[PDB]
Design a protein around this nucleic acid. Structure first.
Ligand SMILES: Cc1cn([C@H]2C=C[C@@H](COP(=O)(O)OP(=O)(O)OP(=O)(O)O)O2)c(=O)[nH]c1=O
Ligand SMILES: [Mg+2]
Ligand SMILES: [Mg+2]
Lengths: 412, 555
DNA sequence: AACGGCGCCCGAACAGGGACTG
DNA sequence: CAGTCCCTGTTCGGGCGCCG
């Protein structure tokens, strides 16, 4: 009884044609069981090979959850319908969500299954379930309702979502509610008991209309930044000052007031690397001034909503990972560091996976966007293991880099 | 008035703005003339081909070759112009089934659908786009033109439609027989069960009659009821499997196209024959772009080929997959970037073997290449068995721990254990983390002219030692590597080296043990002889230490 | 002399970043 | 500041094996 909202691709673009990658046995068995129930419920239907479009699919388990969840890699389809969920029916981002003391993320993707999808657009939601050892050809489906993981789903359901959340927002005018992809971000300044009590009222408010029982909690007021810090030693060697000048020279690309004149004067001649160099009176002055500039904020750094967010990650060793988020080079909007995540001291890929998920979550709260990541890993290494550790219902864009650390810039 | 088959049709459209095929026929021999006129007459009575007239302004030629070495002939249409204008299909064939992924089944039957493509209907609105004339005489009778009511062989959409139509027909039978395994690859059907031989043939006949309801025939010609079964190019026995006999050509004078077929068979043979190498044979296929050019076999390619033929002498076989047992993968280093592995569940009962010998990067080390071989085995194992095997690797736990914890990139290996089978993989040198007290400090640099390609390279040290070497036909990058080489040559066992070259430092910090650059290989040889080496970087053109002094010398 | 699938080893074309020259 | 170079990387299409 609902008229399907017309959905069109961006002009001049064809639908996604991305190959399905191999899945483990437990993932295929999970997807076969899930798709069988969805087909019995009419959410998906089998299709033939005359549909040239395809989108990868796999399965995940969220944090502390034993239940398999179907996840479609709609990244290609999403950027081929970008003028829909950003120009026609866009969701405004609340600037106060990041200021709230506690923010709980609720999985509401199952509500999208109640709204039919435009018949002319269902062909672009095609996916293929693989088989072990290629026993059978691929089992192809396409969606009949709004699919989870498609940016057009919360955009179309937004009108339906507003009416559902309208009584609750009137009951609590201080609560900030943000919707991104399949998730709902609920932030408040109430106490932990008061917050979780209000979260359950919202759950019951949604029930009167399979992962609604979970509530991942955030605390953006506790989020920290990792500035550039300089070492403080009692004695300095030629090697120490050579590393310091190298760090300050690169840092001058961010803070133009940094000087290295009185410090390079200490390195006059051809001295041994371990020779102790006492800092002169002017060198102490120049090093003290540089430490204050690193505390001052960077000039003219603000968020541009029309530009993409970029995230770079550095492996620092011993469970330490630093990251920077920017839109223009050396104009970082945020710098941070993670330590002692899951997989620390045993698994780099699980840590890097965890770090990407945290950075994306922070970007959704602060700006409403997911950044494109520059991952310090080989492509084949990441593509072999990352789905084993993924616990989120969205997937950011990423590319692969290889920058040897000439100077430890973000972590001494 | 042709009867509509029970198989549901597949709606096939064309690319917009384009029409159908209009290609003239190809003059062929009279042997092909008397072998296709009888086909278009038999298919017309069976409803597989209908005759058209002047209302169908299309045409397409058809060249024919014999069937797969048998009494029958094969008809294939040249739809290369129809494929350029037909809509794209998404292929549902995602890979090739491997016999090592088959589980033990008490009873096994291999079927083969007769007239696969000729038993599946074509779209009603698409039959008009398949027009072709048949001249009974090469230059007399104009010949009545026919059309296709089924799937023609040669069309780019025929395989995808048959595989999808076959699945929909097997779905109701598989739902009524869950314990029966049906490997469906094109038209050949591998049917297996743990039922008794008597009860197994009963369900086979039930399946044969089920397929017959849609016009799918399973004749007794290619019906296999007893081992060894010929399935997917293998020999399937009740408890083991092997590849069909592989014959390597033995010529006196070898050309380019012969080595390509030789390396191809050795790749196909390396899935069960352990220790096959194709490094030195494929090395002969470099540079020369003349397929009909004689290439003499090098001494390294001759010894490699002689060792491959001796492996193929003794017959080998693989076993089948048992889900109750673990998967084990063990890797050996064959030298010169060559790796061989075996995947098994019980010792010396290999499911399959394989090799990894890809050289990626100008500079690398054995640890990087071992990591790559592990990733290749993991993805291959997920395709065949859907899980990752436990690895047995010829690298100490301490060696691996040192590499991955110190590398700047994320790297990881799944659950594994050390196996002591030399040659062990190790790191051949370790750069120091702090400067070395008492070791001479070399400030190195090198510059080169973009135009004349001339350059210099040298160093200055804290003890007054100095060198400048002029170089001819070089680059800025090469002189920076040369400067580090000079400092390693002229230093003691412990040395501190200061450079401003991000390029040179990046190569050496990754601890390579092999390189496509002779200069880097010489640098590696020096780094191994040292006891301690500390590399330090400084920004160029900043008046920093001796770097400013050595910069004046070489520029 | 056809179609589709997968694998390997190959080279040409292309992208991208440091560094020097006008 | 552009426009090159040098070096190193990925993508892709074709050679071959094999299947239907
Ligand atoms: C071997 C082969 C096959 N095919 C297509 C056609 C039918 C299926 C199976 O081929 P087939 O089993 O050898 O012949 P088929 O048409 O089934 O006839 P039968 O011998 O089974 O009676 O794949 C093809 O298009 N080109 C080929 O070279
Ligand atoms: Mg057949
Ligand atoms: Mg230099």
């Amino acid at each position: 009884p609902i008229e399907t909202v017309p959905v069109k691709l961006k002009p001049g673009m064809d639908g996604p044609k991305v190959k399905q990658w191999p899945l483990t046995e437990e993932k295929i068995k999970a997807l076969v069981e899930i798709c069988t129930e969805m087909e019995k419920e009419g959410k998906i239907s089998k299709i033939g090979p005359e549909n040239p479009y395809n989108t990868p699919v796999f399965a995940i388990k969220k944090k502390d959850s034993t239940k398999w969840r179907k996840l479609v890699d709609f990244r290609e389809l999403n950027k081929r319908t970008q003028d829909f969920w950003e120009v026609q029916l866009g969701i405004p981002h609340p600037a106060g969500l990041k200021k709230k003391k506690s923010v709980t993320v609720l999985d509401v993707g199952d509500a999208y299954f109640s709204v039919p999808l435009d018949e002319d657009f269902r062909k672009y939601t095609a996916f293929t379930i693989p088989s072990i050892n290629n026993e059978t050809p691929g089992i192809r489906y396409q969606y009949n309702v709004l699919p989870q993981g498609w940016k057009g789903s919360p955009a179309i359901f937004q009108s339906s979502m507003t009416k559902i959340l309208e009584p609750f927002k009137k009951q609590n005018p201080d609560i900030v509610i943000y919707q991104y992809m399949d998730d709902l971000y609920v932030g408040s300044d109430l106490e932990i008991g008061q917050h979780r009590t209000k979260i359950e009222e919202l759950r019951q408010h949604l029930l009167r209309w399979p992962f609604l029982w979970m509530g991942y909690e955030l605390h953006p007021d506790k989020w920290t930044v990792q500035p550039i810090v300089l070492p403080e030693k009692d004695s300095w060697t030629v090697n120490d000052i050579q590393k310091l000048v190298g760090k300050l020279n690169w840092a001058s690309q961010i803070y133009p007031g940094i000087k290295v004149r009185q410090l390079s004067k200490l390195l006059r001649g051809t001295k041994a690397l371990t020779e102790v160099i006492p800092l002169t009176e002017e060198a102490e002055l120049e090093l003290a001034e540089n430490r204050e500039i690193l505390k001052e904020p960077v000039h003219g750094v603000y968020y541009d909503p029309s530009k993409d967010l970029i995230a770079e990650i550095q492996k620092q060793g011993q469970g330490q990972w630093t990251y920077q988020i920017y839109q223009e080079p050396f104009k970082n909007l945020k710098t941070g560091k993670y330590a002692r995540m899951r997989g620390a001291h045993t698994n780099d890929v699980k840590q890097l996976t965890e770090a990407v998920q945290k950075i994306t979550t922070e970007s959704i709260v602060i700006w409403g966007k997911t950044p494109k990541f520059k991952l310090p890993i080989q492509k084949e290494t990441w593509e072999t293991w990352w789905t084993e550790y993924w616990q989120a219902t969205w997937i950011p864009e990423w590319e692969f880099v290889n920058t040897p650390p000439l100077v430890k810039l973000w972590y001494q | 008035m042709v009867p509509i088959s029970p198989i549901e049709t597949v709606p096939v459209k064309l690319k917009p703005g384009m029409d159908g095929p209009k290609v003239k026929q190809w003059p062929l021999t009279e042997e092909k003339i008397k072998a296709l006129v009888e086909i278009c007459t038999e298919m017309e009575k069976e409803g597989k081909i209908s005759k058209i007239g002047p209302e169908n302004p299309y045409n397409t030629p058809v060249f024919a070759c014999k069937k797969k070495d048998s009494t029958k002939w094969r008809k294939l249409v040249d739809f290369r112009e129809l494929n350029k204008r037909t809509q794209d299909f998404w292929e549902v064939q995602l890979g090739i089934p491997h016999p090592a992924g088959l589980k033990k089944k008490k009873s096994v039957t291999v079927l083969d659908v007769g007239d696969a493509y000729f038993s599946v209907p074509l779209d009603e609105d698409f039959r008009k786009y398949t027009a072709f004339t048949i001249p009974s005489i090469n230059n007399e009778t104009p010949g009545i033109r026919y059309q296709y009511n089924v799937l023609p062989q040669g069309w780019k959409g025929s395989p995808a439609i048959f595989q999808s139509s076959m699945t929909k027909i097997l779905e109701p039978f598989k739902k009524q027989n869950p314990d029966i395994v049906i490997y469906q690859y094109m038209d050949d059907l591998y049917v297996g069960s743990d039922l008794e031989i008597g009860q197994h043939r009963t369900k086979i006949e039930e399946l044969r009659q089920h397929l017959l309801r849609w016009g799918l025939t399973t004749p007794d010609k290619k019906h296999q009821k007893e081992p060894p079964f010929l399935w997917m190019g293998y020999e399937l026995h009740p408890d083991k499997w092997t590849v069909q006999p592989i014959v390597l050509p033995e010529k006196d004078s070898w050309t380019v196209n012969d080595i390509q077929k030789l390396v191809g068979k050795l790749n196909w043979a390396s899935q069960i024959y352990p220790g096959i190498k194709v490094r030195q044979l494929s090395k002969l296929l470099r540079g020369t772009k003349a397929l009909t050019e004689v290439i003499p076999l090098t001494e390294e390619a001759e010894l490699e080929l002689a060792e491959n033929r001796e492996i193929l002498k003794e017959p080998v076989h693989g076993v089948y997959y048992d889900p109750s047992k673990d998967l084990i993968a063990e890797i050996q280093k064959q030298g010169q970037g060559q790796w061989t592995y075996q995947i098994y569940q019980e010792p010396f009962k290999n499911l399959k073997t394989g090799k990894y010998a890809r050289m990626r990067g100008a500079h690398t080390n054995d640890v990087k290449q071992l990591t790559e071989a592990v990733q290749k085995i993991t993805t291959e194992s997920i395709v065949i068995w859907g899980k990752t095997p436990k690895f047995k690797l010829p690298i100490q736990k301490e060696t691996w721990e040192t590499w991955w914890t110190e590398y700047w990139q994320a790297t990881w290996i799944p659950e594994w254990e050390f196996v002591n089978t030399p040659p062990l993989v190790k790191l051949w040198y370790q750069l120091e983390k702090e400067p070395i007290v008492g070791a001479e400090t070399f400030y190195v640099d090198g510059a080169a002219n973009r135009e004349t390609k001339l350059g210099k390279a040298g160093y200055v040290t804290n003890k007054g030692r100095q060198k400048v070497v002029p170089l001819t036909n070089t680059t800025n990058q090469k002189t920076e590597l040369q400067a580090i080489y000079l400092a390693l040559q002229d230093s003691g066992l412990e040395v501190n080296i200061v450079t401003d070259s991000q390029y040179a430092l990046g190569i050496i910090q990754a601890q390579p043990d092999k390189s496509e650059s002779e200069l880097v290989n010489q640098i590696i040889e020096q780094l191994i002889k040292k006891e301690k080496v500390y590399l330090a970087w400084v920004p160029a053109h900043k008046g920093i230490g001796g770097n400013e002094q050595v910069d004046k010398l070489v520029s």
